[PDB]
Design a protein around this ligand. Structure first.
Ligand SMILES: Nc1ncnc2c1ncn2[C@H]1C[C@H](O)[C@@H](COP(=O)(O)OP(=O)(O)OP(=O)(O)O)O1
Ligand SMILES: Cc1cn([C@H]2CC[C@@H](COP(=O)(O)O)O2)c(=O)[nH]c1=O
Ligand SMILES: [Mg+2]
Length: 1011
DNA sequence: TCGT
DNA sequence: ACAGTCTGCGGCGCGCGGG
DNA sequence: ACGACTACCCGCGCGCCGCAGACTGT
């Protein structure tokens, strides 16, 4: 009765019959039986060498439930037609855009609202432009308020100017620009357009908008890349332009052009630099200071110049767009990319005003209260020290105070006149003078990060007072007899020059000299020096008695350093968010659901924050936002870590979300498995697909149990090993995870693990350099081989790479690792775009009340009404199985494993936090938050309201109109270069685990090709 | 960019 | 009205922490 | 000079070196 599981030759379970019918339709293989037998023999040899043949795997009853039908014979056609469907009007508006520009009025009128100027006709007053495509710019007086002051727009036929009532007689600075974005489909082009979108009146709606704001900076970063490799390549750029500024004549063609061509193919983010690069345009920037004033009357004069400045910026932005925009179509030609960009260009953050203000006060008060007391106490200690000038015996006798300079400043006295030499602290020690920077300073300014802090607070390392040496930082003296014993402790000997300086200065003080100076260990490396001792990395040294201090303040100070540090980094930006309340604008905050359905309270407090998001701010086309993509998670000790819990949902709504599992490891394993055309052909893939996270049998969890470490540290250790990190750094990582270990044990574990993982290396003439004998050698060779292609393209979609990192622009400097990492990191972005496109299609088709709320990398959250919540969760589970199979079919495999098909957990909550069961108690927050719900596939399928409902007939008919063009996968194009016998002999050499066998195979191959 |  | 002689300011690099 | 490196973003605080600017001294 029950269906029998389906298993491939390896012990891996495939999907059930129904899902196989609905996702892959009808397909067949077995094209090369003999070659498949050979590849199976090699895979069996490797698996038996690594000892995974016959091991039990997880078997589960097949899942079967109905799915929405596809719109094509294959997945590529379906995704092409959906991607063409999601942006029909916008792309057609982006093309046919005007090139000629109309003239500008000789004079401008100061009138409140929107004024339209047409050449040859009188100016008119309009409510709002009624134009499909405009170029737009905003200017605001940031010192006075956050609301805008004036705005300028250009179209194909006319000019438009918007003026605020504040500069027209009124005294209320609160006003937003109206553009009617809820009714008319339109495209607004700008540079850093996220700043402008926050100043539009009709973007503060829960109901979805019909406008698309496009940014040129993302188009510049994506193609014609900034060359931001975060490498000396970025630094060598400013030095070259500094040299060009120095000498007017620049004969760079002799050396700089030859070794580094890439210096002439890119520029910076800024509009002046981008314009200068693409076009010969110079943009003077001297009138921005006028907007830094605190008087509105200065705005009233010079009005014509400011409006002409804004118009010049608009014209420059338009000409920059006209150059950059066609290139992005060449680099990124698949329709899904543009739709995903449009989907990520819209985000909204609901919140409450009074709670935000209370959180902002409670996060600053404790920080200032903690800081003030400790600074006052250390000032008091300095004052107590600074009266020992008269008596020489105590500052000479004391070991710690001898280090400080005690020389009195020279005094210059003029005869019959005042000295007037700007003398600071006459008759005072040098260090106390160095405390005061200027004559005006009456009170010393000191921080726990000061260098003199280990001199003020006396500190002993192994019962030895710390000494300062200019070359070796902090050192501790060791007696002559016990030196060999310290050699057992692996303490390094300090530089001989520092030894001579120490003995010379001591002989100047007296008592001759005894012992030898040993450097304090530094966590990053043995050779690296140490400059601070109150950091986090020394905290365990404070316990166990290795580092000791008589004062109890030091034990306080480290905790203070723990408590406020993140706030010290983030206090400004959090206090600079633009929050708009409901009371000021009472005709704007409309509900997502068309039916009001009551849900109105007794004047409740709702507010909205529009994030400033650059969609492609990275050379791997990832999003960059300064504040909400860097927010910390909640912790018991840290102050202000409850930031993401301020986002809340209005009454009658909730949040539904999910996170991807092992995203970059599953993609890396699939690339390796594509040679054998079977899931599990490599050992790393078999280990990755053995278990599931819900049972606790995932690879990251297994790594942690072997190393005795948490799961996050295991993830760091694995992702460091996949990219190029040596065993020496892995040993230091193991020392960092467990401090109470010796170096030799860590070296043995790291060397053994690296020998079992990577294997050995062989250099040959015909085959350049390769790895062999390891469980992951195939992946390491494959990543390099794809990274040395002349034209590198993303496998799933086909996006290109920036001109800065191409091989033809590189001759001496290589910049190799980023080229390897780039393919996988871009594939993650393609994965996110595919899920966003599928979700948009399903929400439009089945008429759900939902919109995208936030999207951190690999995480998506949606705002959903109470009625349809489980349906929204269902809309997630359909999407992922669509995306993952899309990954498999492009690489040749027409099968998908059952265990990896669905999300492990789907979250339903009222606020944003990592886990639904977290109390989220911080020093600033003393109230627990009620828990939410998490679900899996079976529990979701047991709910009665999960089913979607009846579809709409119009959507399919609209989708069917578009066209589909067949394309060839990129890896099939890569395979054409290699002759077939090369692949067979090369893979046979890779599977061997001995030098003699590899040499014999090379001899056989050379004899065969020779004759 | 630095090691040997 | 020229020629030494100190005494602050300003920019830059590097550690150090969050994702 | 041939090999050897975790990758991508965002910011703050402190010490060091290169110059303007006033004071004598003729
Ligand atoms: N230290 C790192 N070095 C390199 N890549 C990293 C590092 N940390 C994270 N990544 C990558 C791997 C993922 O694609 C992404 C972060 O996703 P994340 O959720 O942290 O991990 P994951 O998806 O592999 O595991 P999980 O099962 O916990 O979701 O960025
Ligand atoms: C810590 C860390 C984060 N990210 C990105 C991906 C996940 C997102 C949130 O990460 P989690 O919420 O902490 O930030 C990286 O790309 N590399 C890293 O090392
Ligand atoms: Mg994940």
């Amino acid at each position: 009765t029950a269906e029998a599981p389906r298993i491939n030759p390896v012990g891996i379970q495939y999907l059930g019959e129904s899902l196989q019918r609905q996702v892959f339709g009808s397909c067949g293989g077995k094209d090369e039986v003999e070659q498949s037998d050979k590849l199976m023999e090699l895979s069996k040899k490797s698996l038996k060498d690594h000892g995974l043949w016959g091991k039990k795997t997880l078997i589960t009853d097949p899942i079967s439930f109905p799915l929405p039908p596809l719109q094509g014979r294959s997945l590529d056609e379906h995704f092409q037609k959906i991607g063409r469907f999601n942006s029909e009007p916008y792309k057609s508006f982006c093309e046919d855009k005007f090139t000629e520009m109309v003239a500008r009025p000789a004079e401008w009128l100061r009138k409140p609202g929107w004024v339209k100027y047409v050449p040859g006709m009188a100016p008119v007053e309009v409510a709002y432009p009624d134009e499909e495509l405009v170029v737009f710019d905003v200017e605001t007086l940031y010192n006075v308020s956050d609301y805008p002051t004036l705005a300028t727009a250009l179209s194909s036929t006319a000019w438009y100017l918007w003026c605020s009532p504040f500069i027209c007689g009124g005294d209320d600075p609160a006003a937003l620009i109206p553009l009617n974005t809820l009714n008319k489909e339109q495209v607004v082009i700008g540079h850093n357009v996220a700043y402008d979108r926050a100043r539009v009146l009709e973007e503060y709606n829960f109901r979805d908008s019909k406008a698309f704001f496009l940014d040129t900076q993302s188009l510049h970063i994506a193609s014609f890349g900034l060359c931001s490799r975060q490498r000396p390549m970025f630094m060598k750029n400013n030095k070259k332009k500094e040299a060009e500024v120095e000498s007017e004549v620049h004969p760079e063609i002799s050396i700089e052009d030859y070794d580094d061509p890439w210096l002439n193919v890119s520029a910076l983010n800024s509009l002046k630099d981008v314009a200068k690069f693409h076009c010969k345009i110079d943009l003077d920037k001297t009138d921005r200071d006028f907007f830094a004033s605190t008087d509105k009357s200065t705005i009233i004069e010079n009005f014509q110049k400011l409006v002409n400045y804004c118009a010049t910026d608009v014209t420059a932005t338009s000409q920059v767009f006209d150059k950059i925009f066609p290139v992005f179509l060449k680099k990124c030609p698949h329709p899904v990319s543009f739709a995903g960009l449009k989907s990520l260009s819209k985000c909204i953050l609901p919140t409450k005003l009074n709670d935000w203000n209370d959180y902002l006060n409670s996060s600053e008060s404790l920080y200032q209260q903690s800081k003030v007391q400790i600074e006052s106490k250390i000032v008091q200690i300095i004052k107590d020290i600074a009266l020992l000038k008269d008596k020489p015996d105590f500052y000479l006798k004391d070991p710690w105070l001898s280090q400080l300079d005690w020389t009195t400043k020279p005094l210059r006295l003029t005869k019959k006149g005042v000295p007037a030499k700007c003398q600071k602290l006459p008759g005072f020690p040098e260090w106390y003078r160095q405390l005061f920077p200027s004559k005006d300073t009456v009170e010393p300014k000191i921080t726990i990060k000061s260098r003199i802090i280990p001199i003020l607070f006396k500190l002993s390392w192994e019962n030895s007072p710390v000494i300062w040496s200019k070359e070796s930082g902090w050192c501790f003296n060791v007696p002559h007899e016990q030196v060999e014993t310290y050699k057992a402790k692996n303490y390094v000997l300090a530089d001989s020059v520092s030894q001579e300086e120490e003995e010379i200065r001591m002989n100047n003080l007296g008592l001759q000299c005894t012992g030898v100076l040993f450097k304090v260990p530094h966590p990053n490396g043995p050779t690296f020096n140490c400059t601070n001792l109150l950091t986090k990395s020394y905290n365990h040294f404070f316990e166990k008695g290795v580092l000791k201090s008589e004062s109890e303040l030091a034990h306080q100070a480290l905790q203070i350093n723990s408590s406020g540090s993140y706030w010290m980094s983030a206090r400004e930006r959090i206090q600079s968010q633009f929050v708009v309340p409901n009371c000021k604008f009472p005709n704007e905050f409309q509900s997502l659901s068309a039916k009001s359905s009551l849900n109105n309270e007794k004047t409740n407090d709702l507010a909205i924050i529009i994030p400033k998001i650059v969609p492609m701010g990275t050379i791997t086309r990832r999003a960059v936002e300064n504040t909400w993509l860097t927010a910390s998670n909640a912790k018991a000790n840290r102050i202000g870590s409850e930031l993401k819990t301020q986002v809340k949902a209005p009454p009658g709504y909730c949040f539904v979300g999910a996170d991807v599992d092992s995203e970059e490891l599953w993609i890396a394993s699939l690339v390796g498995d594509s040679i054998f055309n079977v899931h599990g052909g490599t050992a790393i893939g078999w280990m990755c697909l053995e278990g599931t996270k819900n049972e606790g049998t995932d690879l990251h969890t297994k790594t942690a149990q072997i190393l005795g470490c948490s799961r996050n540290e295991a993830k760091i250790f694995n992702y460091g090993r996949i990219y190029g990190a040596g065993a020496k750094f892995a040993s230091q990582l193991l020392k960092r995870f467990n401090p109470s270990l010796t170096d030799e044990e860590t070296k043995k574990i790291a060397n053994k693990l690296y020998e079992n993982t990577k294997g050995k290396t062989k250099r040959s003439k015909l085959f350049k350099k390769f790895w062999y004998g390891g469980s992951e050698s195939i992946l390491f060779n494959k990543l390099e081989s794809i990274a040395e292609q002349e034209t590198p393209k993303t496998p799933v979609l086909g996006c290109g790479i920036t001109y800065s990192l191409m091989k033809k622009n590189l001759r001496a400097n290589s910049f190799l690792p980023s080229r390897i990492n780039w393919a996988i990191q871009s594939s993650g972005v393609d994965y996110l775009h595919l899920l966003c496109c599928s979700m948009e299609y399903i929400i439009k088709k089945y008429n759900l009340e939902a919109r995208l709320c936030i999207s951190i990398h690999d995480e998506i959250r949606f705002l959903v009404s109470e009625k349809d919540k489980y349906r929204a969760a269902m809309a997630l589970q359909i999407s992922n199985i669509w995306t993952r199979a899309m990954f498999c079919q492009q690489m040749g495999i027409n099968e998908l494993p059952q265990n990896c098909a669905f999300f492990s957990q789907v979250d339903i909550d009222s606020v944003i936090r990592k886990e639904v069961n977290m109390d989220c108690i911080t020093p600033s927050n003393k109230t627990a938050i009620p828990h939410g719900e998490a679900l899996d596939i079976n529990q979701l399928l047991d709910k009665p309201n999960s089913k979607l409902g009846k579809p709409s007939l119009d959507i399919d008919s609209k989708v069917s109109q578009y066209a589909y063009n067949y394309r060839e996968p990129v890896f099939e194009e890569y395979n054409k270069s290699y002759t077939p016998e090369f692949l067979k002999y090369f893979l046979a050499m890779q599977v061997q685990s001995d030098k003699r066998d590899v040499n014999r195979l090379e001899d056989e191959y050379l004899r065969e090709c020779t004759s």
